[PDB]
């Protein structure tokens, strides 16, 4: 109860430290230490006077072999003053506990947070004031040092549950450690005690964190407090806290990233007061001991303190207000642009110009670190308002309508436009969306560029509010978007995806957006959805159905499907029942669009899908979809039992094959997710039919790849619906997961459909009832795309091809660039009072540049002289660390990786229609004789840099890569050759990397996927003098008329044994390929017209390898199939290897084909 006495002055020693490290990889730590003093005076019953006055801190980047808890003498540290004002403040007490603090208004919020952390260690609850219904058991106690209750205490990390335990202190411990009891004469007639607190962060009331994504963290807070005489009238002697955070840097590693912290107080003096502390000027309450936010863009301090501790909802003109990320609280708790050394507009301009200039020298992209610059730019523009964006756009003089993209002189301008467009697409704020809206309104972006812009918005928006969606709706109503067919689909799908992820799915609402910083994004009282949006889509669907336009119907069906609200069932009801006519493809799309309803409302979705299944009058491509969808809802045992029993009397082969394959393949699933369903499938197996179906029928299939060593499970779900006319199935479902622990990366799913394969084949052959309909969908982490098509687009395609051919006659220049990013941030305060930041980034690039000119002739000579460049890069960054606002510094431990592919090449295709000769030529271009073609490095590091400097970390003097002591280097090409390969791996014992590079073992696997992906590697594949090559790499391909002989077809014996035609194909010549063409086509010719495709791949130079190939067969319904073809003979002109592997298949059964494996020489 009475922790303190009136008229006494307590002096405490303050010690703390916060460090980051790479874990078991290295023993190098980066961080800071703090030393200070705390003075507390008890002047009244519930009024305390406090002051923290001495302040010193130092930065450490060392190796700590013994441990992070070791003492470091002041003679080994460079100490600096801590910019905190030693202004007195007041602590208000209630029932022996800390209630709130009173601080002068002219004090920064970060200082208030540090004081919260310091004072939170004086909070001892011995009488169970924060009762958790366990203090009643402790009530009948009298002089009992033992107590093991539970409570709910206050700390900078939040207001979370804490476990208590009290027991007396023995004299042996005190003798070993005099540090615990500085002055021991204060116990008087009592005894010493120990209090241990263990903090649980799972269940908790007040939470403060920032999130954006789509449990790997590990928090552990413990305390150790020693108190003097009595459990009611005592004195605090020492208090220490210890916290630890563990993160896997790249989501698939062994949890190596650490952040550690501690706070320390030891009593120094206690004596009667002589001079009192001055009263607090300009008082104001700071709430409880929990972290508080700030206004980043305000000139004066503005604290949101509960008495709702929540930042205001983002608007559509001003920047969002966050208080846990480096760009918002780095500069003394305020915005970075307030520094003066940083002007946002000029920084953005310089970064854009640098990125645009560096894209011309693509072979040096990894060296210059362009993609890291792109990420820095995207981070920087999230702190801009619309006025600043408009000023920047006007200042860079961008007018793509005026600019000519086809001119080689104007390349940097187009690159600036491209980089700026990509950066705004990835910004994700309100001003960015206003900028995009203004662009589309005026006409700066028209069809495909705008469709690409809209395709990425749902995957990059961070704060989807009501105003954001209202503006999106207003944009959807625009004449320009509505009239264009391609832009409309992208815009509508993105709108519906955002609606769903922001309002419908509670899991999406809570676990994907920073709710604990801004509150719930959309108020539950907003009836805008049901009164405005869904009726609009219903009207549009009705109009589209009336006019009989396939792509519009498909777009609105997908749009209503992706919402996932139960009202879409009433929306779809008139079409499903049969009052309104609809085709089978459209009905299948409607039934498959119900996927997100199964995730959110499993019972109702199960009811409707089972009702669809039980009907025997629906087409099989409806019921198969119903089966494939039901098993995503975890049915009960009776359901599966009845479904399995149904197979005996069911009269459809497709449905039975679907259910049997799904149930049988649902057995081997020994995973934490499908365990119960696997057991149910095992229990029901003994009732399925004994009939077996061919692989051409509809079948589902699930792959489980469980790896105990890697602790990662990879899944693979494949559903396809067979057809009664062609072997190729009509509909294909494909999905890839990647689960490690509990967190999963967003999945990649592909959907392909077509109404009739025979119709598609007939249209394809003609170019050289049920309408032709089809669509393709790719939904991955980067964008959502949907291409629906009808017969009109198929008939328009040849016109576009002819127009392109006639337009590239004189010569055309092309410049296509593409940039994509992926983000995931997680931030929360530590137990010292400082932000903790975790980031995971991926950046991609696909650049295709060069001049292309063609020619077409009445002789059908499609003569082309192409000249291209090809590039692909990928950067992956994973970082963990913390920020110190009082010096704008950021401490990072992480691993970065790179991958780079460059394809400088020149092509001359001379394909002739009358005679199937398509002779290519591949050259190295002039001035590019020596160039880099490959790069792959993985680099772990510890960094200590300044936020005001917007530069890649590789150029910062504080960064330190982890180079092993015994690093070595290898140059694989033994002597002079065409190719140069370097490996700069280290430790001479990685084995998995220096064995795949041996290139002398035949059994060695060339695949490098199976390797340790956490080590310093660096590989470069250069090229020395392959250029200036007059001799080309001939790639000549011939063709055959595919004739057949009737006498040989009749009375032709069929045997499983396969003969070898190698002696007949001894001559490896394209001209001699005509001689061998008759033998290959003639063999096994039973009313079949099969041609031969012979390629003569020839490589000139010092080493020549005349690789040859032959595919001579075709698929015919009348024929018995079985392809006899294939031989790869490689001859060295100097030392002939004569590697001549051959294959073949003459089974002629339509069931095992006998294939010869190899034959050497
Ligand atoms: C919370 O913070 C407080 C201080 O803010 C820490 O208290 C300190 O704890 C350390 C370690 O327990 C103490 O260090 C020990 O000091 C002893 C006395 O130092 C000298 O004192 C005088 C000079 O003033 C000399 O005349 C005398 O002869 C002593 O030499 C040392 O004897 C101890 O030596 C230990 O280390 C050496 C070298 O490794 C070994 O050879 C020894 O065998 C022995 O293990 C030791 O250095 C320090 O005194 C404490 N400070 C105070 C003010 O009491 C708490 O430890 C901290 N809490 C946590 C959890 O870290």
- Give me the helices (H) in 161-293, please: 171-176
Give residue 267 CA to ligand 1 midpoint distance, Å: 15
H/E stretch holding 830: none
Give residue 895 CA to ligand 1 midpoint distance, Å: 38
Distance set, CA 977 to CA 538, 904, 1023, 1132 (Å): 67, 18, 9, 15
CA 21 – CA 1014 distance, rounded (Å): 15
Contacting residues for 919 by C-beta, under 8 A, at least 6 apart = 909, 910, 1034, 1035, 1036, 1037
Report which protein residue has its CA nearest ligand 1's atom 51. 179
Give residue 230 CA to ligand 1 midpoint distance, Å: 28
For residue 361 and ligand 1, the question of a CB distance below 6 A is answered with: no
Report which protein residue has its CA nearest ligand 1's atom 57. 264
Give residue 406 CA to ligand 1 midpoint distance, Å: 75
1088-1118 per-residue burial string, b: 16 or more CB within 10 A, e: under 16:
bebbbbbbbbbbeeeeeebbbbbebbeeeee
Largest Cα–Cα distance in the chain? Answer: 124
CA 355 – CA 543 distance, rounded (Å): 46
Give residue 61 CA to ligand 1 midpoint distance, Å: 24
Give residue 178 CA to ligand 1 midpoint distance, Å: 9
Q: CA neighbours within 13 Å on the CB side: how many for 526?
A: 17
Q: Which two tokens stand for residue 1072?
A: 């001699």
Atom of ligand 1 at shortest range from CA of 268: 53
Give residue 348 CA to ligand 1 midpoint distance, Å: 53
What does DSSP say about strands 1092-1097 and 1035-1037: parallel, antiparallel, or unpaired?
antiparallel
Report which protein residue has its CA nearest ligand 1's atom 14. 179
- In the three-class reduction of DSSP (H, G, I as helix; E, B as strand; rest coil), residue 731 is classed as strand
Count the Cβ atoms, other than its own, within 10 Å of residue 345: 15
H/E stretch holding 365: helix 365-368
Count the Cβ atoms, other than its own, within 10 Å of residue 988: 11
For residue 264 and ligand 1, the question of a CB distance below 6 A is answered with: yes
Give residue 227 CA to ligand 1 midpoint distance, Å: 20
Contact, 1097 vs 1109, CB < 8 A? Answer: yes
Give residue 165 CA to ligand 1 midpoint distance, Å: 27
For residue 74 and ligand 1, the question of a CB distance below 6 A is answered with: no
Give residue 54 CA to ligand 1 midpoint distance, Å: 21
CA 22 – CA 29 distance, rounded (Å): 8
H/E stretch holding 657: helix 653-665
Report the residue numbers after which the chain has a gap, meaning the C atom sits over 2.5 angstroms from the next written residue's N, or none: 214, 307, 768, 1150
Give residue 787 CA to ligand 1 midpoint distance, Å: 72
Distance set, CA 189 to CA 233, 660, 749 (Å): 12, 80, 73
The reported resolution of this PDB entry, expressed in Å, is 3.0
For residue 97 and ligand 1, the question of a CB distance below 6 A is answered with: no
Burial of 75 (0-12, 13-18, 19+ CB in 10 A): exposed
Report which protein residue has its CA nearest ligand 1's atom 54. 179
Contact, 263 vs 116, CB < 8 A? Answer: no
Contact, 981 vs 1018, CB < 8 A? Answer: no
If one residue of 74, 179, 182, 261 were mutated to test the ligand 1 pocket, choosing by the most ligand atoms within 8 A of its CB, it would be 179
Report which protein residue has its CA nearest ligand 1's atom 36. 71
How would you write 856-909 as a 3-class SS string? CCCCCEEEEEEEEEEEEEEEEEEEEEEEEHHHCEEEEEEEEEEEEEECCEEECC
Secondary structure (DSSP) of 680-719: HHHHHGGGS-S----TTS-EEEEEEEEETTTTEEEEEEEE
What does DSSP say about strands 825-829 and 835-854: parallel, antiparallel, or unpaired?
antiparallel
Count the Cβ atoms, other than its own, within 10 Å of residue 866: 16
Report which protein residue has its CA nearest ligand 1's atom 1. 264
DSSP 3: -
Specify the experimental method: cryo-EM
DSSP 2: B
CA 313 – CA 329 distance, rounded (Å): 18
Rg of the chain's alpha carbons, rounded to an integer? 36
Atom of ligand 1 at shortest range from CA of 69: 61
Atom of ligand 1 at shortest range from CA of 13: 5
For residue 13 and ligand 1, the question of a CB distance below 6 A is answered with: yes
Atom of ligand 1 at shortest range from CA of 182: 54
Distance set, CA 775 to CA 733, 750, 787, 790, 799 (Å): 12, 11, 5, 9, 21
For residue 266 and ligand 1, the question of a CB distance below 6 A is answered with: yes
DSSP 1063: T
Give residue 265 CA to ligand 1 midpoint distance, Å: 15
For residue 268 and ligand 1, the question of a CB distance below 6 A is answered with: no
Residues 1066-1071: contacts with CB under 8 Å, at least 24 apart:
1068/1096, 1068/1106, 1068/1108, 1068/1129, 1068/1131, 1069/1096, 1070/1036, 1070/1038, 1070/1094, 1070/1096
Give residue 266 CA to ligand 1 midpoint distance, Å: 13
Report which protein residue has its CA nearest ligand 1's atom 60. 240
Residue 35 phi, psi (nearest 5): -130, 140
Report which protein residue has its CA nearest ligand 1's atom 15. 179
For residue 15 and ligand 1, the question of a CB distance below 6 A is answered with: yes
Give residue 245 CA to ligand 1 midpoint distance, Å: 28
Contact, 293 vs 311, CB < 8 A? Answer: yes
For residue 84 and ligand 1, the question of a CB distance below 6 A is answered with: no
Report which protein residue has its CA nearest ligand 1's atom 56. 179
For residue 239 and ligand 1, the question of a CB distance below 6 A is answered with: no
Q: Which two tokens stand for residue 34?
A: 């703090």
Give residue 73 CA to ligand 1 midpoint distance, Å: 11
For residue 237 and ligand 1, the question of a CB distance below 6 A is answered with: no
For residue 241 and ligand 1, the question of a CB distance below 6 A is answered with: no
Give residue 175 CA to ligand 1 midpoint distance, Å: 13
Atom of ligand 1 at shortest range from CA of 178: 54
- In the three-class reduction of DSSP (H, G, I as helix; E, B as strand; rest coil), residue 550 is classed as helix
For residue 224 and ligand 1, the question of a CB distance below 6 A is answered with: no
- In the three-class reduction of DSSP (H, G, I as helix; E, B as strand; rest coil), residue 262 is classed as strand
Give residue 174 CA to ligand 1 midpoint distance, Å: 13
CA 520 – CA 512 distance, rounded (Å): 12
Give residue 168 CA to ligand 1 midpoint distance, Å: 23
The residue among 655, 669, 713, 665 whose CA lies nearest residue 685 is 665
- In the three-class reduction of DSSP (H, G, I as helix; E, B as strand; rest coil), residue 59 is classed as strand
Contact, 56 vs 36, CB < 8 A? Answer: yes
Report which protein residue has its CA nearest ligand 1's atom 47. 71
Report which protein residue has its CA nearest ligand 1's atom 55. 179
Atom of ligand 1 at shortest range from CA of 240: 60
- Give me the helices (H) in 931-1090, please: 1046-1049, 1070-1082
Atom of ligand 1 at shortest range from CA of 177: 12
Contacting residues for 23 by C-beta, under 8 A, at least 6 apart = 255, 256, 257, 258
For residue 852 and ligand 1, the question of a CB distance below 6 A is answered with: no
H/E stretch holding 567: helix 567-577
Q: Which two tokens stand for residue 262?
A: 């501690």
CA 424 – CA 392 distance, rounded (Å): 12
The residue among 594, 584, 683 whose CA lies nearest residue 611 is 594
The residue among 656, 726, 662 whose CA lies nearest residue 693 is 656
4-26 per-residue burial string, b: 16 or more CB within 10 A, e: under 16:
beeeebbebbbebbbbbbbbebb
Give residue 183 CA to ligand 1 midpoint distance, Å: 15
Report which protein residue has its CA nearest ligand 1's atom 10. 179
Give residue 832 CA to ligand 1 midpoint distance, Å: 23
Q: Which two tokens stand for residue 180?
A: 């615990």
Contacting residues for 1148 by C-beta, under 8 A, at least 6 apart = 1054, 1055, 1084, 1086, 1120, 1121, 1122
For residue 41 and ligand 1, the question of a CB distance below 6 A is answered with: no
Report which protein residue has its CA nearest ligand 1's atom 13. 179
CA 888 – CA 886 distance, rounded (Å): 6
Give residue 181 CA to ligand 1 midpoint distance, Å: 13
CA 371 – CA 362 distance, rounded (Å): 12
């Amino acid at each position: 109860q009475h922790n303190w006495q009136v008229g006494n002055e307590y002096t405490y020693l303050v010690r703390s430290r916060t460090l980051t490290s790479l874990g078991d990889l290295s023993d190098v730590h980066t961080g800071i230490l703090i030393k200070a003093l705390l003075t507390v005076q008890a002047k009244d019953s519930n009024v305390l006077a406090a002051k923290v006055w001495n302040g010193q801190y130092a930065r450490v980047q060392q190796s700590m072999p013994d441990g992070w808890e070791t003492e470091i003498s002041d003679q080994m540290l460079e100490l600096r003053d801590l910019p905190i004002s030693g202004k007195p403040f007041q602590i208000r007490m209630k029932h022996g506990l800390i209630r709130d603090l009173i601080v002068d208004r002219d004090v920064p919020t970060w200082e208030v947070n540090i004081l919260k952390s310091i004072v939170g260690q004086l909070q001892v609850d011995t009488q169970g004031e924060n009762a958790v219904k366990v203090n009643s058991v402790q009530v009948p106690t009298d002089d009992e040092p033992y107590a093991s209750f539970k409570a709910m205490e206050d700390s900078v990390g939040g207001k979370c549950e804490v476990l208590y335990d009290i027991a007396p202190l023995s004299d042996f411990v005190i003798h070993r450690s005099p540090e615990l009891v500085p002055m021991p004469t204060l116990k008087g007639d009592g005894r010493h005690m120990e209090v241990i607190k263990i903090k649980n962060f799972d269940n908790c009331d007040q939470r403060i964190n920032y999130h954006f994504g789509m449990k790997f963290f590990s928090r552990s807070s413990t305390s150790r407090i020693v108190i003097s005489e009595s459990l009611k009238h005592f004195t605090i002697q020492s208090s220490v806290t210890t916290s630890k955070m563990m993160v896997s840097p790249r989501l698939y590693d062994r949890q190596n990233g650490l952040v550690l912290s501690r706070m320390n107080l030891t009593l120094a003096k206690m004596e009667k007061t002589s001079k009192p502390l001055p009263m607090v000027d300009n008082p104001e309450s700071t709430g409880n001991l929990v972290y508080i936010y700030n206004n980043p863009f305000s000139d004066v301090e503005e604290r949101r303190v509960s008495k709702d501790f929540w930042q205001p909802k983002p608007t559509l003109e001003d920047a969002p207000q966050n208080s846990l990320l480096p760009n918002f609280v780095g500069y003394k708790g305020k915005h970075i642009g307030k520094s003066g050394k940083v002007d946002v507009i000029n920084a953005a301009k310089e970064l854009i110009f640098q990125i645009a200039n560096e894209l011309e020298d693509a072979s040096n992209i990894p060296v210059h670190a362009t993609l890291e610059k792109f990420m820095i730019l995207c981070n920087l523009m999230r702190t801009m308002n619309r006025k600043q964006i408009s000023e920047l756009e006007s200042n860079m003089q961008i007018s793509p309508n005026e600019l000519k993209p086809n001119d080689k002189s104007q390349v940097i301008k187009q690159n600036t436009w491209t980089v700026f467009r990509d950066a705004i697409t990835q910004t994700g704020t309100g001003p960015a969306f206003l900028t995009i809206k203004e662009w589309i309104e005026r006409g700066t972006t028209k069809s495909m560029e705008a469709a690409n812009i809209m395709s990425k918005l749902p995957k990059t928006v961070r704060t989807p509010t009501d105003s954001y969606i209202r503006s999106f709706f207003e944009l959807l109503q625009n004449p320009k978007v509505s009239n264009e067919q391609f832009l409309n689909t992208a815009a509508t799908l993105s709108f519906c995806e955002m609606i769903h992820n922001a309002q419908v799915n509670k899991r999406s609402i809570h676990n994907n957006y920073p709710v604990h910083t801004f509150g719930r994004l959309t108020s539950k009282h907003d009836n805008s959805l049901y009164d405005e949006y869904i009726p609009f889509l219903e009207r549009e669907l009705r109009k589209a159905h009336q006019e009989k336009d396939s792509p519009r119907i498909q777009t609105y069906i997908m749009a209503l499907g992706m919402i996932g609200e139960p009202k879409i069932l009433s929306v779809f009801e008139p079409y499903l029942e049969g009052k309104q006519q609809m085709t089978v493809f459209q009905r299948t799309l409607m039934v498959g669009s119900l996927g997100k309803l199964t995730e959110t409302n499993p019972k109702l979705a199960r009811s409707v899908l089972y009702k669809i299944y039980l009907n025997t009058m629906e087409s099989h491509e409806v019921r198969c979809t119903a089966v494939f969808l039901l098993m995503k809802t975890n049915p009960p045992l009776s359901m599966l039992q009845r479904m399995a029993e149904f197979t005996k009397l069911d009269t459809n082969r497709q449905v039975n094959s679907a259910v049997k394959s799904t149930i049988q393949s649902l057995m081997k699933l020994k995973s934490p997710e499908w365990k119960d369903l696997a057991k149910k499938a095992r229990s029901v197996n003994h009732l399925l039919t004994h009939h077996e179906y061919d692989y051409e029928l509809s079948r589902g299939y699930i792959d489980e790849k469980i790896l105990e060593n890697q602790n990662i499970i990879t899944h693979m779900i494949l559903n396809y619906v067979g057809s009664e006319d062609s072997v190729i199935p009509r509909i294909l479902y494909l999905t890839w997961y990647s689960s490690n622990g509990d967190i999963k990366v967003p999945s990649t799913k592909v959907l392909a459909m077509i109404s009739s394969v025979k119709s598609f084949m007939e249209l394809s052959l003609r170019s050289v009832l049920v309408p032709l309909e089809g669509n393709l969908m790719i939904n991955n982490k980067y964008a959502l795309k949907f291409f629906p098509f009808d017969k009109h687009i198929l008939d328009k395609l040849p016109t576009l091809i002819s127009n392109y051919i006639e337009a590239v006659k004189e010569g055309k220049f092309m410049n296509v660039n593409m940039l994509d990013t992926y983000e995931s941030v997680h931030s929360f305060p530590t137990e010292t009072g400082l932000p903790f930041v975790y980031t995971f980034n991926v950046i991609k690039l696909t650049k295709t540049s060069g001049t292309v000119q063609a020619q077409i002739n009445p002789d059908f000579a499609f003569i082309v002289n192409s000249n291209l460049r090809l590039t692909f890069s990928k950067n992956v960054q994973g970082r963990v660390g913390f920020v110190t606002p009082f010096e704008h510094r950021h401490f990072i431990s992480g691993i970065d990786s790179n991958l780079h592919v460059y394809a400088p090449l020149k092509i001359s295709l001379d394909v002739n229609t009358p005679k199937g000769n398509m002779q290519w030529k591949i050259w190295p271009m002039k001035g590019e004789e020596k160039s880099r073609l490959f790069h792959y490095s993985v680099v772990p590091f510890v960094s200590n840099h300044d936020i005001l400097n917007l530069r890649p970390l590789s150029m910062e003097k504080g960064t330190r890569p982890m180079i092993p002591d015994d690093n070595t280097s290898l140059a694989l090409p033994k002597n002079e050759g065409p190719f140069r390969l370097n490996v700069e791996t280290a430790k001479t014992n990685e084995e998995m990397w220096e064995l795949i590079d041996t290139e002398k073992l035949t059994d060695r696997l060339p695949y490098p996927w199976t390797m340790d992906n956490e080590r310093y590697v660096k590989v470069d594949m250069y090229m020395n003098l392959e250029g200036e090559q007059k001799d080309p790499v001939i790639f000549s391909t011939s063709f055959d008329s595919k004739v057949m002989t009737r006498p040989d077809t009749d009375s032709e014996n069929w045997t499983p044994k396969m003969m070898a035609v190698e002696p007949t194909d001894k001559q490896a010549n394209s001209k001699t390929r005509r001689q061998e063409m008759m033998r290959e086509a003639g063999r096994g010719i039973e009313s079949a017209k099969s041609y031969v495709v012979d390629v003569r791949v020839h490589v000139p130079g010092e080493s020549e390898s005349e690789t040859v190939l032959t595919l001579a067969w075709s698929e015919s319904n009348v024929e018995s199939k079985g392809r006899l073809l294939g031989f790869w003979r490689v001859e060295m002109p100097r030392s002939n290897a004569d590697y001549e592997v051959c294959i073949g298949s003459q089974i002629m059964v339509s069931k095992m084909d006998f294939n010869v494996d190899i034959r050497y020489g």
